[model samples]
Target: PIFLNVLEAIEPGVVCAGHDNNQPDSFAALLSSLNELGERQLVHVVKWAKALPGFRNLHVDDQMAVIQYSWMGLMVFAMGWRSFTNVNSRMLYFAPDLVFNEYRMHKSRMYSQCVRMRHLSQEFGWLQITPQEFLCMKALLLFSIIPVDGLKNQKFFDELRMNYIKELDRIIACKRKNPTSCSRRFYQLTKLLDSVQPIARELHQFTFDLLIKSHMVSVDFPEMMAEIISVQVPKILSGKVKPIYFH
Candidate 1:
């Protein structure tokens, strides 16, 4: 009946983790019955639909499938170089806080586990494949696996807590060294991550698997991405103040 409530209804949780709630079944069933437009048409609705809780973690394949399709959807939906570069540029600014500044323990690991687990699959070349991005995406997917207003797995929560601080500490150790360029953008990157949050954090879960593919997989693919990024990414500004970033 109301717009904000409707937005909240679809995307109710402030934190995107799976809670063992009850609302997802009805939501999933509704989508199951209505997913008639094929993957292309269903991308927008289903991508959002899966965030209803219990929609993700159905099958590892299903989880990865959503991401593969989502990328393609975004590629087409973005249209032209400006929109595409804008996406990368936005991510560059957003990466700092979303991963680093936000600083959640379990969410990050969830991303690692999801990507690493799926990496064993040869099919998902995962174009850009970074452990860092994988972890964030996995954390987001947690929301889709649970029912609305539900409780998430205690084990999942605990695992993240344990690994989160540890990983941060390890990263700090390297940053302190001030010698390597591996994670040169570590500090700034994490800050960016915190600034930009996702439309439906659940979608982040799928990105790791889709992006970690072979750089040599296809000439056209990278060419297209490069062209897109050339135009789209540069336009996204990263200001120390009044940052406009997304995750």
Candidate 2:
């Protein structure tokens, strides 16, 4: 909460004007920040997993198994995208919170579908997309990493809807005097979004959609997905994940 308070006090809009151009250095900073946050999240996830009834009921090995693999189970979510340059440095303030929320939603959905289908093979296919898409997404994520690589993903278009967007709107509403503090948040999101625009287009449909009727999610809808990314990221970085993806 101190970070949030620190971020709130900064009043980011002061620095956010036309910030779409901030690049390579910003990219590097993004990676380092994420790398740090990723570690923090893993610790949170382990503590969380241990408390779940499903997790605690498992034997020591199974508990460890779930602990080991819980994160990989969180990376297949859809419908969330944010940009680093769209706002300000303060955008990092909300990054982890928004990220974890998406992860939680995806995890809950994935498990529900698996239970309903009662088929491991099919469930695996659902979350783990194809090799081609996985590779493309990975390439983009790398670009999204340190030095803010380069914007190559279309998800950039969706960045505006993020919570930080609200933060930007708030500053504008309150009429903050510090221009840099006020604008930096939005610019960071925009700039970050700019970097990923190319990846989405170039990936040649990294995600595919399926039309289906299901009351489970409130209405008939399309399903689009790629292999788990963030969930397996730690494992990939640490060399503990199963080497199933060739892309």
Candidate 3:
């Protein structure tokens, strides 16, 4: 509930402005700030994940498994939640101050990856998603899972995932009287998740690579971020590894 309060306080918005042509250091600072925001929210994300109706009843290992798999996906969802709708053809803002466009991305070694995300974001922007829809998508991403080689308590995760999926159905249906309209919007929104998947993967990898490379100079990435990137054992206590992904 407090997390919802925080989400409300931020008030996602867009303002008309032209590019300032940020310097390299300023762009780097933006990346750092993005990580900081992710780190802070990740705590609340894990708490929210565990608090989902059936999640607490699962074994702790399964709970950690859900967190580990969902972490980066949720980060990408958060990024899109704040993303500017195609107000301009060129840019997106991860935060009010941290605006990005092709030219700014050109300065970084990640230019290609930035291009990938920018276009995907443009697609997301076009959807005209509202705050409630955005929050529901975040929850969907958080519980989503793919089969892993040695997963334990698989049914619990699947059930939790289904709960969110059905909740998604309910949310989308609430405002639509026509079954056809509800079905169409439901189709479009869920289809949007497919486009979001590869983007989330690449974005996560890009951030993880940036953090790892930065550590070569100095260890600046937050421990919580490290956990999310699958760099360290989740603070949930099982120091184990497995091949996992979101569905």
Candidate 4:
């Protein structure tokens, strides 16, 4: 309930520009908009974590650790949700105007992975995934334990993590009356989490590679987003922070 309340408190602020300015359906336009959305989404995810009572209580360094570790997973999850909403349209809706087809992002191997993640969401019928369930899934990523090198207060977070998983199971179980049915659905839900993990990592690596390899600076990577994929990404003013290339 609290999560839902907080989730509702904020709205997306980025304006969708398909290719207006000095652009004409360019890759540069797509990349710029994608980074813009990434920056906004990154900010919101950090806020979402802070909105969590458990997350807010942790030490600042621990909070950053969770954000850094969880940011990619959260990005994939959000992308999945967007994919679901755009399932009928068959494009990854970056905004009202900025949607992309497979060919649009053909140069990046990361684009293909993103499309795969979208297809996975469609395969699972995730648009049907409820708010409570989505919140629990997001929380699962946010509260998950990370074995990152310098993080402290692992015990504190693990305690919270266990509770989130239990809550996720309970939420899934609430869906069906038959124990057998509930068990099957719960199993599937956790399995979805399993599936998202590798895609998340792939997406993260892809984005980082795009940034690093292109050696393209300024126009491509926003300042917050730059740090997000940095070698020394921020740990916690509650700073900021996706994958794959296409065919």
Candidate 5:
């Protein structure tokens, strides 16, 4: 319960995309707002991660590496939950100010990714995911990806990940007195977590391509966004870093 308590306590609050809704949606404008939102969310994510129960146990370098590498997945998973909770899975609530309706989804040039995200959102409702499960799963995501060569402190990272998994198990079994029921719930939750990786991968690819020709498209990526997309994201794309899939 302490881990869940910490997760609930450190959960980041609402972040708004400073989008100008009055202006007509354009590829460049929508993407720029998305980029800005990504930057803003990253700030909160760093703070939240540092405050997690066992986050500080890893080497500092590993800590930053994991956060940078897994950020897209984290954002996508959180955004899916936001869409589920705030809009009943009708649209992507990227932020309070940046809701992605069908029109915006088409204009954003990532309609396919958005559709996948919406499906992810609907799963939250379909499965009736609990708040504790959501929190624990989000934390698990932070530990779900790594470089193939391993982290600077692989042993410590492994321990942290193991404990997070145990916590998720605890949360899943908390109410289910039946072993069969508990295992079934665990299977469903882990499968749901696994589903997030592909969506994140597609978004990562989209952002990478967008960043490459941003100038031609007139899209503006923020300083940190550009840096991570150029530097860290390429590692994942090139098979240097990879997601730890549950399947």
Candidate 6:
């Protein structure tokens, strides 16, 4: 209850894209808006992570590393939930002003990734995920990926991850009276969490490529966004970092 209370209290509020809806849809404009949104959302993500129950137990450097590394997946997962709750998964609710409709999806040149994200949104409804469960899972996601070489304080990181997982199990058990039903729900939720990794991986690759030829395409990446993409993202892409999967 305390952990859930902390998570709910620290939850970041609505973030806008600052997108100009009147502008005609184009790859460069849409991507620029998304990049800006990423930068803005990241600012809140840092604050949110620091307020998490045991997040500060991480080594100082590990804290930054995890946030930078897991950011895309965190954003993607939260966006899916927003899309599900706001528009019933009709489109991606990337931000209040930057919803991705079919046309925008096509124009963004990331149609396949968008399709996967939309499907992730639909899964929230199909699974009947509660808001409490969503919040706890989102926090867990912040600990889900890491460098293969491990963190400066891997033991602390592992302990924190275990505690978060226990919190998730407790949440699942609270609603399910039967032990079998509780385990079944746990299985379903973990599987759903694992499904997020591949979608995040695709988007990571897409963004990395976009950043590479940003000048040619006229898409803009913000200062911090560009740095993380060039620095932390490649480690994941090259398999130096990996996501922990339940399967």
CA RMSD per model (angstroms): 20.5, 21.7, 6.0, 5.6, 0.7, 0.6
The residue-by-residue lDDT of candidate 1 on 1-247, one tens digit each, is: 1322333455311211121223332322222221121133334445554553344434544443333323322322212111123333222111111211112213333344323222222111223324333233332323222222223343443344344334443544543565354344444434333322231222232222222332332212233333433332222212111212322
lDDT of 3 at 53: 61
Cα lDDT, all candidates: 0.30, 0.30, 0.60, 0.63, 0.93, 0.95
Clashing pairs in 5: none
What ranges in model 6 sit over 4 Å off? none
Could you give candidate 5's per-residue lDDT for residues 44-162 as a string of tens digits?
A: 99999999888999999999999999899999999999999999989999999999999999999899999999999999999999988999999999999999899999999999999
What's the count of clashing pairs in each model shown? Answer: 41, 57, 0, 15, 0, 0
TM-score of 6: 0.99
lDDT of 6 by residue, 1-247 (tens): 8888899999999999899999888899999999999999999999999999889899999999999989999999999999999999999999999999989999999999999999999999999999999999999999999898899999999999999999999999996799999988999899999999999999999999999999999998998799989998899999999999999
Write down the worst ten-residue block by lDDT for model 4.
238-247
Best by lDDT: 6
**Stretches > 4 Å off in candidate 5:** none
**Candidate 4 C-alpha lDDT tens digits along 1-247:** 5544654464334445444544554655567777777676777777777877577667788897677767777776766666566554376655566666777646334576767776756744643677577767767777643554435776777677777777777777664778898777777667676677677666666676677754554347787778767743332211232211111
**Candidate 4 similarity to native, TM-score:** 0.79
The candidate 1 region of ten consecutive residues with least summed lDDT is 92-101
Model 4 clash tally? 15
Tens digits of lDDT, candidate 3, 1-247: 4434443444333332222335444545555565676566666667667665667866787677667666666765655555545333366555555566666666444577666656656656577676666777767776655433444777777777777677777767777899998888878787776666666556656665676687564435667666556543332223243322322
lDDT (Cα) of model 5: 0.93
lDDT of 3 at 180: 99
TM-score of each: 0.24, 0.26, 0.71, 0.79, 0.99, 0.99
Candidate 2 to truth, TM: 0.26
